Ligand binder design. Structure first.
Ligand SMILES: [Zn+2]
Ligand SMILES: [Zn+2]
Lengths: 703, 731, 137
């Protein structure tokens, strides 16, 4: 079963390919509609794998150096194995001398094709958490942020380092525990500082005067954080507070760049509004002029966007090169400037949380998801990851899309045609979780080809780990080229891998045009039809869902930015470029459930025909969980119904990282708009029925 | 008295045994009794010359020396709703006006007739005419802004060397003991800044568990980090500043900051005080080397170096003028152990009406003299009265023109002096000249008005008026000469000559001043003949040439000579004389010829001796009054009765080496010497420490440096000085 | 917004209390003293004056004038509320001694209450007659 195959492969190797059978001929490889690509999750959890506490045992060839895997041919007599990538024959190390057939190493069993090693390079560095706190906000918002911080401070490992940077009009680097005075370093939030400058102006496990262990400081910090007060400078009438977020961040980056470079560190920046002063300015201090919108940026009425973005873009590279994570937690009624600051959590593995106020159940709970621990009381986050991908000599890498930066490492596996962050065999992911998913795009130049994903990262325990995943997919039999390929198509994976491409070109500019030419080309190669007869068009069960996915994608909030704020668009795209397949599907096409007296909860269609008056709905957009009460039910048996969706909601309303906004509305309420909008150029669309009619009118015509 | 001529080569004992008194101007009995106090206001020539030709012939300088803000025993305060001032020259109504029509008075400075307003009513019995020294209440138009509050911003250096000196402890302990005694009401504001490589502000809020230290490290671009709690209200934050003063000395014990950013730190302090003004106290301990205002090191001279002074940069001069404009005064406390270019640093106080204080090689253990000296000098400094945003005007009758000012201030338009602060221990001097012949009048007058804001927020004006008669004979000019005032105005002129030319020309000008005046007197009449008013002129000018300001063949260093010059330019005349020509007494045999009138205390009055070792005696002990200190020298063969009954010691060998003061033993000998010492230090507001360390071998016999009549390997004796002058008088 | 507060005795214009912070003041302080001179027993008890970018506001109670200046953009509603808080405190503390004093600024120590009340109105996160001043002068 091709479905059981896709499931089990994503369960074991945490990967979802668009094609599980690959073209064996250059003619079909060039004429590939949806490219061969993978939805790869390097740190996916699974039924408790055995952590390997020895060296991974590489191949003996300067160019290859691939890891021993279940695809290698072993000779238990000669103590020799043959590399499956370069055919080089290797001697078993002395540690493997007593190798036996009836008792073979873990890295050779097909069950451990994806396996993790524990390596020791030296002393385990402690974790680093740098709080960068905005003080230009109301007291209720500031006090709540203080309560959220003291909560996160209590979950940290004692060995971990902490530092506090508060800011408003000025930027204060706090030196903690100096007894009797409690001092800080004040800087001007109007001019940017480099790292060498910041090192000059400021000056057994290591620790600075500003980054001290929690165990020795958690008491002076929890008293400083409790005495924090709003930015002391007045805010005159009709003005915004002078908020120097661009400089506050560059000082946070610069501080860690000269003290703990190339080590796991988390820069957590908390914002209560836009940056109104210094580099990276998002808007002036005049409340008369509103923050830019998508309309203003299209009509050239936003003079701070380009200049502001470049500043934060230079900091994102500075932090990603050094290897540190930048999180952004924005809570404010107005916009905040996520569009200009998106690159900091996007190039790194940083989080981006959004909300209206730090004094909400929405933010408070979301923030503690960051510090969720596993079966050993340790954080579900890694740091300083290096992903290297080994391919067969016939496969080349076009590039990756997702939270990563190129290490610009050349080799025979690098493809000329690059896509996204391409032109390399190695990428750096400063932050990752068991959820972080990348999108690797490949190019083809008894069968079977293989790809090896090697990810070396720093575990929250301090150990250094290497995760090796080796997969193999069959080469297409030349007597059944397109027939085998057609049967191995992952319509869900391809849809997200194609959405990944469209959103990437949109956020770095038509895009809908390319998305429609590829939908038609896919219909014209793998669909059955007679020429000039639209009625004749059918799609295999392998392809039938692709058009519906493409229907919701081109209308989704990821490619139609208007009706959303620029911060909302970047936030939506931020999470879609990191999530796995199941969550990425929910984003593009929300899931719907029906609740009525006539039957248990059931999944229905995203069509206005499902909005019944005598029925309660439960729509799952990844960003919001909604419960709709029809005009009838909008008034013990009537209690089982009104709380059936509220019960099913709470379950999923906790596992998801960015806690989706909860909504309770009914027919006539102003909040039912979110349901009526997700319901229902080339391939100009009204609704799905018309979309398919037009799609078939163009598929059966000239190609 | 005496209209008699003196032959200095035969007398050689012309210094009287009793203290010198300021000459009485040759005025009518009813005018002199109303004349101003000579301590507050005095002139070098009590008989003003009539023509400039006459003044030039005399070869003597004409000028005034004033101590306008001195503490008074009784001060009349006039609260008149109108200040009677001449409608032309704005001179205040003074005792020496001429009432004619009884409703019209003639101004004694511009001769204009003015109308007495109805309110002033016998108008000659008004207190404004019965007192030369008087303090008014300034109206609404005599202040540019509401009375500024008293602001006290202390600025501490906390480099590695500063922490070694240990000065911070006593300074903080002095501020603790004198916190309720700072001048001011509930409006009093206080502040603190420490600095080294970076400027450190200190916030004080009652909502916080402790003060907060805010460090600005941008040296090339300083700013104020917080707008509210940096200059706090002393009355409300009393408990907070106390904890900070108890904590400040303990914060830097282990510092490695070897450099100090003096320049940028004052720019910060200036910005902090600019909105209001006040008194900026600066404590520096070493050469500034980091940031703007950095100064290069200098090699100290030796005895062998000739006379070959000026600031190395104008940074601290420009900053002082910026403080002046904002009614900020800077007082510089230099506790340096090595050269620090005080010639440059001092400009921060000279042009901002501050005052510099010097404690060479301060150390909390090694130098106990500088500790108790700083202790007592901080006592006066913190408790003495103060005035803020002050100006001063010196007016003199038509014909006389002021042309040179001396003192710590900034001269705006001529005759206008800007005093950001005014302290009751500053002296000022002026040099004037006859611009128009005084054939008309036979009396002249001089007035000084001090418009200042009191520590209680009351804009006050203190006015002094001096009247002097005009003469037309050369001999009448000499008869009214004030030798001490001449020495003072000469000392000030010689300081400028050092900056403008060199130390050589300054010394030559001082010697030529005695030659040219006595040569002019000789032409106007064998030995060295001088008038009675100039018998002590070559002695004092000699003592000037041996003072640390102008001495040559001494091992004196750069910051020593500069500070001596600062004291010449900022001290009243009385203390310039006490330092230059100390008063010597023998105190091992005091008796009852004293002023035993002060009820139960005798207070012996021993005769004054001249500054020559030939007057000493190894058999007794001698106390020397140098104004600032009372060095008690004990002889080797001293009497046994003086050892046990006065020193509490059984032999000369067991006299404690650093003896910081005398013991108050229960003996009539100790009762007499403690009665005479306590009477000397009561004549001044700056308590002088008395150290008897001056044994015959304490390596601290600078007591002999003040024997200005004797010779040394690099200076003439008093008899050799007289011989040098006589050869030049009759060349 | 910004600040300028002066309290004067209307009969003669004798200054009572004030409060000024810069880091010009010389021009508008004079105008404030020109107005105190013109104010008499026929002047409006509550009035507002326009001085271009600046705007004066004052009240008169017990022969005492409470004048404030700020940028015209400052709410006139908040200006008179700031003056009301000053009068009720000043009349309660010194209202009976005003007609007796004769020194300029005999109530300087009111500097503290003026400034602590001042900040409660010049910060948004804490919450009659009109004529050109040039006419009355
Ligand atoms: Zn190999
Ligand atoms: Zn006159």
């Amino acid at each position: 079963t091709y479905l059981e195959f896709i499931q089990q492969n994503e369960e074991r190797d945490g990967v979802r390919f668009s094609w599980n059978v690959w073209p064996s001929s250059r003619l079909e490889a060039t004429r590939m509609v949806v490219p061969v690509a993978a939805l790869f999750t390097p740190l996916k959890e699974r039924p408790d794998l055995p952590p390997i506490q020895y060296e991974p045992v590489l191949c003996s060839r300067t160019t290859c150096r691939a890891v021993l895997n279940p695809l290698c041919q072993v000779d238990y007599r000669a103590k020799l194995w043959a590399c499956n990538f370069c055919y080089q024959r290797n001697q078993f190390p002395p540690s493997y001398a007593g190798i036996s057939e009836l008792n073979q190493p873990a890295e050779l069993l097909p069950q451990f094709s994806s396996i993790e090693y524990v390596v020791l390079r030296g002393p385990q560095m402690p974790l680093i958490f740098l709080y960068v706190v905005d003080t230009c906000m109301e007291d209720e918002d500031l006090q709540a942020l203080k309560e959220s911080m003291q909560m996160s401070l209590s979950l940290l490992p004692p060995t971990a380092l902490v530092g506090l940077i508060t800011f408003g009009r000025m930027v204060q680097v706090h030196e903690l525990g100096c007894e009797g005075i409690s001092k800080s370093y004040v800087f001007r939030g109007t001019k940017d500082l480099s790292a060498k400058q910041l090192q000059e102006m400021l000056g057994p496990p290591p620790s600075n005067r500003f980054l001290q262990p929690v165990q020795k400081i958690d008491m002076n910090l929890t008293d400083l954080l409790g005495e924090l007060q709003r930015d002391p400078w007045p805010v005159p009438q009709g003005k915004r507070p002078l908020r120097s977020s661009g400089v506050a961040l560059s000082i946070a980056v610069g501080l860690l760049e000269c003290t703990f470079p190339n080590t796991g560190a988390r820069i957590m920046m908390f914002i209560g509004g836009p940056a109104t002063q210094g580099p990276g300015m998002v808007v002036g201090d005049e409340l008369k002029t509103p923050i830019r919108s998508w309309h203003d940026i299209d009509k050239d009425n936003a003079k701070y966007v380009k200049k502001g973005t470049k500043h934060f873009e230079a900091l994102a590279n500075r932090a990603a090169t050094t290897g540190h994570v930048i999180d952004i937690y924005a809570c404010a009624l107005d916009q905040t400037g996520l569009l200009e600051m998106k690159c900091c959590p996007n190039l790194t593995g940083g989080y981006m949380v959004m909300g209206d106020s730090f004094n909400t159940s929405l933010f408070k709970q979301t923030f503690q998801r960051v510090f969720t621990k596993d079966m050993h009381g340790q954080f579900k986050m890694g740091f300083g990851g290096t992903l290297e991908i080994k391919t067969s000599r016939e496969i080349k890498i076009s590039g990756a899309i997702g939270p990563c930066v190129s290490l610009n490492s050349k080799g025979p596996c690098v493809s000329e045609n690059e896509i996204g962050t391409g032109g390399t065999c190695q990428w750096k992911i400063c932050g990752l979780s068991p959820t972080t998913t990348l999108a690797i795009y490949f190019e083809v130049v008894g069968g079977r080809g293989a790809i090896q994903f090697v990810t070396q990262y720093q575990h929250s325990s301090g150990q250094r780990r290497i995760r090796v995943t080796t997969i193999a997919r069959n080469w297409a039999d030349a007597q059944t080229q397109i027939q085998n390929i057609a049967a191995s198509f992952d319509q869900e994976a391809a849809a997200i891998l194609m959405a990944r491409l469209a959103i990437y070109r949109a956020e770095t500019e038509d895009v809908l045009r390319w998305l429609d030419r590829q939908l038609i080309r896919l219909c014209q190669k793998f669909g059955e039809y007679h020429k000039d007869d639209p009625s004749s068009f059918r799609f295999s069960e392998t392809f039938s869902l692709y058009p519906q996915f493409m229907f919701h994608l081109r209308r989704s909030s990821f490619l139609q930015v208007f009706n959303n704020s620029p911060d909302e668009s970047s936030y939506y795209r931020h999470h879609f470029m990191r999530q796995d397949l199941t969550q990425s599907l929910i984003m593009i096409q929300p899931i719907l459930y029906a609740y009525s007296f006539s039957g248990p909860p059931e999944p229905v269609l995203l069509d206005s025909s499902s909005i019944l008056a005598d029925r309660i709905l439960l729509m799952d957009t990844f960003f919001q969980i909604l419960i709709y009460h029809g005009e009838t039910i909008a008034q013990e048996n009537f209690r089982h119904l009104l709380q059936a969706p509220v019960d099913d909601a709470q379950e999923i309303l906790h596992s998801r990282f960015p806690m989706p906004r909860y909504i309770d509305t009914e027919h006539g309420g102003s909040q039912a708009r979110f349901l009526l909008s997700k319901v229902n150029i080339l391939t100009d669309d009204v609704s799905l029925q018309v979309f398919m009619d037009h799609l078939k009118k163009l598929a059966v015509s000239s190609a | 008295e005496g209209l008699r001529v003196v032959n200095l080569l035969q007398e050689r004992n012309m210094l009287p045994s009793t203290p010198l008194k300021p000459p009485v101007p040759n005025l009518h009995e009813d005018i002199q009794k109303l004349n101003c106090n000579p301590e507050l206001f005095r002139c070098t020539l009590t008989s003003i010359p009539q023509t400039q030709a006459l003044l030039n012939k005399a070869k003597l300088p004409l000028g005034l020396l004033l101590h306008p803000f001195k503490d008074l025993v009784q001060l009349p305060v006039v609260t008149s709703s109108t200040i009677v001032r001449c409608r032309s020259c704005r001179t205040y109504i003074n005792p020496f006006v001429s009432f004619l029509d009884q409703r019209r008075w003639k101004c004694n400075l511009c001769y204009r007739v003015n109308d007495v307003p109805e309110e002033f009513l016998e108008p000659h019995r008004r207190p404004e005419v019965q007192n030369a020294t008087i303090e008014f209440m300034a109206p609404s138009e005599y202040m540019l802004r509401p009375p500024q509050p008293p602001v006290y911003l202390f600025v501490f250096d906390v480099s590695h060397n500063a922490v070694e000196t240990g000065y911070l402890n006593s300074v903080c302990q002095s501020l603790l003991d004198n916190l309720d005694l700072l001048p001011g009401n509930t409006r009093t504001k206080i502040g603190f800044i420490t600095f080294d490589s970076t400027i450190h502000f200190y916030g004080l809020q009652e909502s916080l568990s402790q003060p907060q230290m805010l460090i600005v490290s941008d040296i090339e671009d300083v700013f104020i980090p917080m707008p509210e709690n940096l200059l706090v209200n002393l009355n409300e934050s009393k408990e907070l500043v106390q904890d900070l003063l108890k904590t400040l000395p303990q914060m830097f014990t282990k510092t490695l900051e070897t450099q100090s950013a003096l320049g940028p730190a004052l720019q910060a302090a200036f910005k902090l005080m600019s909105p209001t003004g006040g008194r900026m106290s600066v404590f520096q301990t070493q050469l500034p080397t980091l940031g703007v205002g950095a100064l290069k090191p200098r090699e100290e001279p030796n005895h062998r170096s000739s006379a070959k002074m000026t600031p190395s940069t104008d940074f601290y001069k420009k900053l002082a003028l910026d403080c002046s404009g904002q009614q900020v005064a800077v007082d510089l406390f230099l506790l340096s152990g090595q050269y620090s270019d005080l010639a440059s640093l001092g400009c921060i106080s000279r042009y901002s009406a501050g005052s510099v204080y010097y404690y060479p090689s301060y150390h909390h253990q090694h130098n106990p003299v500088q500790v108790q000296k700083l202790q007592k000098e901080l006592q006066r400094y913190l408790t003495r009265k103060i005035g803020f945003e002050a100006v001063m005007r010196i007016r003199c009758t038509k014909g006389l023109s002021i042309h040179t000012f001396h003192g710590n201030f900034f001269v705006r338009s001529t005759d206008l002096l800007s005093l950001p602060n005014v302290n009751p221990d500053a002296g000022y001097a002026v040099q004037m000249s006859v611009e128009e012949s005084l054939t008309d009048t036979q009396l002249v007058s001089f007035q000084s008005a001090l418009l200042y804001t009191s520590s209680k927020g009351e804009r006050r004006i203190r006015v002094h008026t001096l009247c002097l008669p005009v003469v037309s004979t050369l001999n009448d000019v000499f008869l009214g000469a004030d030798v001490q005032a001449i020495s003072g105005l000469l000392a000030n002129m010689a300081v400028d000559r050092s900056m403008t030319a060199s130390l050589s020309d300054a010394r030559d000008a001082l010697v030529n001043a005695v030659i040219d005046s006595l040569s002019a007197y000789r032409s106007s009449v064998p030995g060295l003949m001088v008038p009675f008013s100039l018998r002590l002129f070559p002695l004092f000018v000699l003592a000037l040439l041996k003072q640390k300001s102008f001495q040559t063949g001494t091992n004196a260093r750069l910051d020593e000579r500069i500070f001596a010059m600062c004291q010449v330019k900022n001290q009243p005349l009385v203390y310039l004389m006490l330092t230059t020509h100390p008063s010597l007494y023998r105190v091992d045999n005091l008796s009852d010829e004293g002023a035993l009138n002060i009820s139960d205390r005798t207070i012996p009055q021993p005769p004054i001796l001249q500054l020559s070792v030939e007057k000493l005696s190894r058999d007794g002990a001698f106390l020397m009054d140098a104004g600032s200190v009372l060095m008690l020298w004990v002889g080797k063969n001293c009497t046994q009765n003086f050892l046990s009954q006065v020193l509490g010691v059984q032999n000369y060998a067991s006299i404690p080496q650093p003896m910081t003061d005398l013991p108050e033993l229960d003996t009539p000998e100790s009762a007499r010497i403690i009665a005479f010492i306590s009477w000397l230090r009561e004549q001044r507001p700056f308590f002088p420490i008395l150290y008897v360390i001056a044994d015959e071998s304490p390596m601290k016999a600078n007591f002999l440096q003040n024997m200005i009549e004797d010779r040394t390997e690099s200076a003439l004796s008093y008899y050799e000085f007289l011989l040098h002058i006589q050869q030049q008088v009759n060349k | 917004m910004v600040l300028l507060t002066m309290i004067a005795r209307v009969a003669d214009g004798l200054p009572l209390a004030a409060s000024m912070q810069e880091d010009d003041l010389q021009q508008y302080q004079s105008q404030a003293k020109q107005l105190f001179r013109k104010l008499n027993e026929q002047s409006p008890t509550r009035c507002t004056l326009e001085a271009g970018a600046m705007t004066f506001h004052y009240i008169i109670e017990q022969g005492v004038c409470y004048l404030v200046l700020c940028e015209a953009a400052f709410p006139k509603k908040l200006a008179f509320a700031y003056l009301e808080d000053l009068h009720s405190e000043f009349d309660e503390q010194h209202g009976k001694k005003v007609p007796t004093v004769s020194r300029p600024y005999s109530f300087i120590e009111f500097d503290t209450f003026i400034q602590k009340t001042k900040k409660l109105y010049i910060d948004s996160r804490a919450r009659i007659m009109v004529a050109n001043i040039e006419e009355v002068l």
